Every structure is written in C-alpha cells, then in structure tokens.
Amino acid sequence: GSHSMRYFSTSVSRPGRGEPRFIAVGYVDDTQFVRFDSDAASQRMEPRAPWIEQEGPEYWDEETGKVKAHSQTDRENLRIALRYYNQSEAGSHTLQMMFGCDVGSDGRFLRGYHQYAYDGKDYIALKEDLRSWTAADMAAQITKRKWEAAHVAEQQRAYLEGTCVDGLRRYLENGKETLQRTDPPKTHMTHHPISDHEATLRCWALGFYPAEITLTWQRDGEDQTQDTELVETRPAGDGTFQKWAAVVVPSGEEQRYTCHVQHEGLPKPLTLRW
Amino acid sequence: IQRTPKIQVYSRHPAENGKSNFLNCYVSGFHPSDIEVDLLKNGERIEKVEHSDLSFSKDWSFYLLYYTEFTPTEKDEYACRVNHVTLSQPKIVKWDRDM
Amino acid sequence: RYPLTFGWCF
Numbered sequence: 383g384s385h386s387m388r389y390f391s392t393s394v395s396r397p398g399r400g401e402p403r404f405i406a407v408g409y410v411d412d413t414q415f416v417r418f419d420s421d422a423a424s425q426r427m428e429p430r431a432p433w434i435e436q437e438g439p440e441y442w443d444e445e446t447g448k449v450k451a452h453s454q455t456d457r458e459n460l461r462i463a464l465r466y467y468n469q470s471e472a473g474s475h476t477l478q479m480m481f482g483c484d485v486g487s488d489g490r491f492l493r494g495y496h497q498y499a500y501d502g503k504d505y506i507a508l509k510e511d512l513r514s515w516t517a518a519d520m521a522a523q524i525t526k527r528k529w530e531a532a533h534v535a536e537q538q539r540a541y542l543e544g545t546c547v548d549g550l551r552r553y554l555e556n557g558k559e560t561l562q563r564t565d566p567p568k569t570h571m572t573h574h575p576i577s578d579h580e581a582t583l584r585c586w587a588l589g590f591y592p593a594e595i596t597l598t599w600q601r602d603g604e605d606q607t608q609d610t611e612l613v614e615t616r617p618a619g620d621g622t623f624q625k626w627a628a629v630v631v632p633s634g635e636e637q638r639y640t641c642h643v644q645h646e647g648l649p650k651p652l653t654l655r656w
Numbered sequence: 657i658q659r660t661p662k663i664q665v666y667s668r669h670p671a672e673n674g675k676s677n678f679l680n681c682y683v684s685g686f687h688p689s690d691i692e693v694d695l696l697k698n699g700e701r702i703e704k705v706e707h708s709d710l711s712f713s714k715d716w717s718f719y720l721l722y723y724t725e726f727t728p729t730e731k732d733e734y735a736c737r738v739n740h741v742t743l744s745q746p747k748i749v750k751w752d753r754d755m
Numbered sequence: 756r757y758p759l760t761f762g763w764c765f
Contacts, residue, residue: 462765
C-alpha cells in the first residue's frame with residue numbers, strides 16, 4: 383500500500399522566560415523516527431526508531447543543522463506574527479509546521495504538503511498543485527506575497543517530489559520489517575448493566591497497525607450514532623494502536639446490535655454481536 | 657480558541673492482577689500545548705512517568721502519551737490527573753479496567 | 756529528510 387513521511391514542529395513563545403521552545407518530530411506512516419527538542423542538553427536530532435540508528439554521521443549532522451536552523455527561523459516568525467496581528471509581547475503564542483510526502487506501492491510520488499498554523503489555526507499552506515499558496519487571513523496574505531516573490535513554492539516542490547520521496551523510499555527499505563508490516567485488530571465485546579432497564583455494550587479493537595481503523599454500530603442492520611460513544615484511537619505504547627466504540631442498549635435487546643470493524647489488515651470486515 | 661483535552665487512562669494489556677503491564681494516560685485534541693499530566697496510585701503521584709514527544713493531528717490539536725510500568729493488584733487504585741488552561745481545576749480520571 | 760527552511764520567513 384501507500385506510505386507517508388511527515389515532520390511536525392511546534393514553536394511556543396514564553397514571554398520574559400527567554401527563547402521560545404521548539405520541538406520537532408518525524409514519522410514514517412504511524413511510526414515516529416526522530417525528535418528534536420530545543421530545551422534538551424544534546425542539541426541534536428535524535429533517533430526514535432531502531433531502523434534509523436544505522437544512518438551515518440553525515441546524516442545526523444545534516445539533520446541537526448537543518449532542524450536547529452528551522453527553530454531560529456520560527457523563533458523570528460513568532461516575532462513577525464506578533465507585529466502582523468498587532469499583539470503584545472506579553473502573551474504566549476504557538477507556531478506549528480507540517481511537511482512531507484505520500485508515495486504509492488510502486489514508490490512513486492502521490493502528494494506533498496507544506497503548511498503552517500498560528501495559535502492553532504491555519505495560517506499558510508502549499509496547495510496540492512505545489513505551485514501556489516492558501517493564505518487563511520490578511521496576515522498570511524503578506525507572507526504569501528513574500529513567498530511568491532522568493533519562489534519558495536518551486537523550491538519546496540522540487541524537494542517534495544525528489545528528496546522527500548527518495549528519503550521515504552530509503553527509510554521504508556531500512557525499516558522494512560517494522561514499516562511494511564500490517565497487524566490486524568484483535569477484537570472482543572464487553573457488557574455492563576447501567577440499570578434495571580439498560581446496559582452498555584463496548585466493542586474493542588486492540589494491537590493493530592497502522593492506526594487507521596473504522597468501528598461502527600448498527601441496530602437491526604442500520605447504522606447508529608444515537609447513544610453511541612467512540613474514543614480517539616490511542617497508542618498501546620508498543621507500536622500498535624487501540625480503539626473502542628460503545629452503545630447504550632435496552633436490557634435484553636443486546637442481540638439486535640452489531641459492531642463492524644474495518645482495517646487494512648483484514649481481508650473482510652469483522653462483525654461482533656453479544 | 658482553546659481546545660480541552662480528551663483524556664483516556666488504560667493499560668497496555670488487559671489487566672490481570674499480578675502480571676506486569678503499562679499504565680497509559682493519553683491526552684489528545686488539546687490547545688494550547690502547555691499541559692501537565694500526572695499518574696496517581698491511591699491518590700499519590702507516581703514518581704517516574706515517561707511521555708512521548710509533543711506531536712499533533714490533522715486539525716492541529718496536540719497529543720501526548722504518559723506511561724509507566726506497573727503491576728496491578730486488587731487493592732490498588734489508579735488515576736490520571738490532567739492540568740490544562742481550559743480546565744477550571746485539574747481533571748482526575750480513574751483507571752477503569754474496561755473504560 | 757527534514758526540510759530546507761531558510762526561505763520560510765513570514
């Protein structure tokens with residue numbers, strides 16, 4: 383199937399308290415592989431997966447240089463955004479950046495991304511054509527003119543279609559055993575009476591990889607969202623993921639309800655009934 | 657805008673008294689990123705708790721996982737305590753062996 | 756491979 387590489391960085395200003403904090407992480411698919419934290423002692427891009435530790439010193443040095451430089455650019459960018467939004471030097475603000483590419487089974491480029499958020503909201507993003515920008519507001523419009531003038535799009539385009547895809551292909555081969563594995567969900571049901579009149583049914587999916595999964599309740603064959611509750615998909619902490627979906631159900635009516643589980647590790651969807 | 661954390665406290669594996677396991681508190685969907693998360697054993701804060709590196713989702717909301725090795729027993733109770741701007745007081749969520 | 760971010764000035 384297809385794969386993705388992503389870098390996520392967060393920069394957080396701390397007035398009075400000195401320089402902003404900057405944290406970046408990299409993932410292939412749903413597997414983290416590097417981190418950088420401006421607050422920590424090392425001051426290096428660090429490995430967070432086994433299959434990356436094999437990269438040579440040139441790699442660690444290049445990646446360290448690139449990520450430190452970005453921390454400084456985004457520290458200045460916070461300063462600039464203050465001015466654009468006429469905001470005071472008193473409060474804390476956040477700048478977030480996402481970057482990366484998707485590739486198909488053949489390893490060919492599918493899609494690239496480069497986007498920013500200020501204070502948790504879209505600021506500027508590269509459009510899917512990788513030739514133009516979306517600016518979310520008037521401030522972002524000022525950045526968009528600058529980036530147009532300086533040909534930022536053509537630079538990032540070349541990188542996403544080249545360096546990013548070539549990089550993704552290398553990582554997928556080095557981490558083949560980890561990354562090109564699919565683990566299907568192990569599933570079960572739980573049942574708890576809430577009263578004389580009602581019961582909760584909880585449909586579980588455990589130990590699955592990648593994180594993408596769908597859990598849906600039906601009653602008598604019909605999709606149901608009334609009286610249902612679905613938690614966010616969550617890391618087990620060992621490389622796999624968990625999720626559950628519950629419904630509140632009249633006592634003795636359990637058998638009418640079915641949970642349906644879709645995941646790419648499954649040749650056909652599973653149904654569960656109490 | 658600010659977004660309040662969605663908080664889950666669960667074990668890595670289905671819990672059996674006497675078998676070691678990990679206790680997780682996953683917080684997701686929040687903004688701003690400043691957050692404090694403590695795990696409690698019978699109301700007392702657990703000393704050694706790891707967490708993941710700050711990351712975020714498609715909608716820009718942050719997520720973190722805190723965790724520690726542990727061996728559940730019939731006697732002991734566990735909770736996560738989450739301290740965030742959006743919350744008037746810290747939210748304390750008891751570990752429920754089935755959520 | 757982390758991006759080249761020199762030109763990303765707001």
